[PDB]
Amino acid sequence: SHHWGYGKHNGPEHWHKDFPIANGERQSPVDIDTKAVVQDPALKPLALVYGEATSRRMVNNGHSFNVEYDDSQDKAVLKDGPLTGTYRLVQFHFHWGSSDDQGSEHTVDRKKYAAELHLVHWNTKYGDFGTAAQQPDGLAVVGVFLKVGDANPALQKVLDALDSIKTKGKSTDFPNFDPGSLLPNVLDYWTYPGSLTTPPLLESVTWIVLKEPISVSSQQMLKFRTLNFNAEGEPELLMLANWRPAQPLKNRQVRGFPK
Numbered sequence: 600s601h602h603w604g605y606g607k608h609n610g611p612e613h614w615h616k617d618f619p620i621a622n623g624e625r626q627s628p629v630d631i632d633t634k635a636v637v638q639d640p641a642l643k644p645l646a647l648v649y650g651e652a653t654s655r656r657m658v659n660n661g662h663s664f665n666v667e668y669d670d671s672q673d674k675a676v677l678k679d680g681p682l683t684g685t686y687r688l689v690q691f692h693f694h695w696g697s698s699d700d701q702g703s704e705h706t707v708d709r710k711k712y713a714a715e716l717h718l719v720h721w722n723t724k725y726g727d728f729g730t731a732a733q734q735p736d737g738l739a740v741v742g743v744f745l746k747v748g749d750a751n752p753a754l755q756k757v758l759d760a761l762d763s764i765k766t767k768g769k770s771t772d773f774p775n776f777d778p779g780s781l782l783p784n785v786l787d788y789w790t791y792p793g794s795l796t797t798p799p800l801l802e803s804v805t806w807i808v809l810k811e812p813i814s815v816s817s818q819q820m821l822k823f824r825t826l827n828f829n830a831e832g833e834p835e836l837l838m839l840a841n842w843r844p845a846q847p848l849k850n851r852q853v854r855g856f857p858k
């Protein structure tokens with residue numbers, strides 16, 4: 600009955616009451632002020648090694664929907680970029696807004712995109728996702744902006760499944776989806792140390808925010824908003840918006856690759 604969300608009484612501005620780390624030193628998302636971005640020769644190109652990724656199911660968790668990957672072996676991994684070691688892909692999900700002018704979590708010189716994709720990975724040094732989530736070098740999330748414009752056929756494959764998982768707790772089988780199909784052609788990125796953008800808001804995420812967006816149509820964006828926060832039987836609560844706004848940078852440094 601009490602959890603958290605994006606509504607009038609359970610929203611981001613209140614999360615600190617239940618999760619005090621909400622007001623911590625390394626919270627996400629942030630605005631990326633491009634004039635302030637630092638060039639670090641230590642940064643490498645990203646290595647997203649997704650050829651053998653095994654998608655399992657798509658699930659409505661009552662705050663967004665996740666496409667879940669098999670993370671029992673090194674099947675889809677992220678390495679290099681700002682990272683040391685190997686990070687296994689566990690899931691991806693999206694955030695979006697109630698109209699096309701808003702919905703991304705990260706912003707770029709205060710600009711908001713319509714949505715943002717998060718590919719979530721964990722450091723195999725820690726044995727499991729949960730253990731990794733509690734360490735500063737434990738997680739790496741790749742964020743990809745969705746910019747309104749042309750319809751995205753790879754995204755349409757995801758959106759065609761949402762009618763199966765309209766309500767909280769529903770899941771559907773979702774095999775053979777290549778998470779690489781949702782990446783831009785150029786993998787230039789910004790990086791900074793931050794947090795999970797939902798409860799439990801843990802400060803364990805090396806953020807990797809791609810500079811180049813992928814496309815989405817306005818029509819496609821309507822489809823995100825047909826999901827429900829609630830479980831079947833309960834009063835309907837449309838998943839109109841599920842983004843946390845920019846949080847204070849607090850003298851963290853955003854680095855850019857290749858500049």
Ligand SMILES: NS(=O)(=O)c1ccc(C(=O)NCCC(=O)/N=C/Cc2cnc[nH]2)cc1
Nearest residue numbers: 667668689690717719740794795796797799
């Ligand atoms: N918005 S975010 O990317 O900062 C983010 C990412 C993850 C969480 C989180 O709380 N993680 C739970 C993910 C999950 O459900 N994993 C289950 C294990 C699994 C095994 N196979 C697939 N999934 C919160 C915010």
Ligand SMILES: [Cu+2]
Nearest residue numbers: 602603604662
């Ligand atoms: Cu909740």
Ligand SMILES: [Cu+2]
Nearest residue numbers: 602603604661
């Ligand atoms: Cu909720």
Ligand SMILES: [Cu+2]
Nearest residue numbers: 602603609617
């Ligand atoms: Cu609460």
Ligand SMILES: [Zn+2]
Nearest residue numbers: 692694717796
């Ligand atoms: Zn997210």
